Each structure stands twice: as C-alpha cells, then as structure tokens.
Amino acid sequence: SMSVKKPKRDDSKDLALCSMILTEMETHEDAWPFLLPVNLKLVPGYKKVIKKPMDFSTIREKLSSGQYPNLETFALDVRLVFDNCETFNEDDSDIGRAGHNMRKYFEKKWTDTFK
C-alpha cells in the first residue's frame, strides 16, 4: 500500500529473455501455422469467430516496439495464439496437434526461465 512495498523482483532482463523464448518458438518445426497472421480474406469463418487474432510475427513486432508493459502481457499474447488455434482447429489435425505441441514447448520455457 502507500509507502509499503514488497521487495523489487529484478525485471531488467525480461525483454531479452522474452525475445529469446520467442526466437525459440519461431524456429520450432511446428511453428508454421503461427508464423504469420491468418489470412482473413481467404479463411472462411476466421474473422467472425476469432475475436482477437494473434501470431508470432505480430508478437515479435509488439515486443520490438515497446508494446508489452510487462512479461505477463507477453505471455497472454503467446497463449492467445494457442487458444485461438484450439478454438478453430480439431485436436486431431496437423494444425491442432502443432498448437498443443507449441503450447507445451512454450510453458516449459516460461517456467524454466521465470519460475
């Protein structure tokens, strides 16, 4: 509360470490459904159904331009990518399985880096 603060957790490396995690996700062989925004002109249903589209290129641009206020807002956008994928794709599709694999991969890097 006012003039009463918990000790300062060092966040000075967070930007660099989120960038490293994002590089690792970008270079994973199963990243291909997630590298670019879904083409809203060419994929029926996507625009209406997926209220907040997100992809790795869009996170990379946000990261590079100071649009994440903290590491939690970064993780929210990453998870959004996989949440959208599960909303639109059957679990037993190539894209559906890619999304499960990538979410697993991300959550381990996240825990190992920050928890």
Side-chain angles (χ1 to χ4, degrees), residues 1-7 9-12 14-114:
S1 70
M2 196 187 328
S3 312
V4 180
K5 284 301 147 346
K6 288 211 187 54
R9 191 217 157 238
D10 183 5
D11 66 348
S12 60
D14 289 355
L15 180 66
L17 290 160
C18 289
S19 176
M20 291 172 58
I21 293 170
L22 181 54
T23 295
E24 294 157 2
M25 277 190 308
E26 289 162 337
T27 59
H28 192 297
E29 68 162 288
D30 302 338
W32 59 265
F34 315 113
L35 295 179
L36 299 178
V38 173
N39 186 332
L40 299 184
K41 300 173 199 293
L42 306 180
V43 178
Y46 208 85
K47 196 172 199 296
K48 184 65 183 274
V49 171
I50 298 299
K51 302 307 183 171
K52 292 174 69 175
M54 185 55 55
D55 69 285
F56 295 168
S57 79
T58 297
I59 301 172
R60 170 66 72 191
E61 185 62 37
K62 287 180 67 167
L63 194 64
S64 289
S65 59
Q67 291 187 68
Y68 296 113
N70 55 59
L71 86 167
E72 300 304 337
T73 58
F74 169 81
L76 282 171
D77 263 357
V78 176
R79 291 169 181 146
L80 174 63
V81 172
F82 305 131
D83 291 349
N84 290 343
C85 181
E86 274 197 62
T87 294
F88 206 82
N89 294 272
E90 279 291 344
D91 298 340
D92 188 11
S93 59
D94 294 280
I95 292 172
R97 277 188 283 282
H100 292 296
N101 287 351
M102 292 303 310
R103 180 191 301 272
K104 188 80 175 175
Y105 189 74
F106 168 67
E107 288 307 345
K108 169 101 158 74
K109 305 278 184 185
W110 189 252
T111 295
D112 292 354
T113 303
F114 294 115

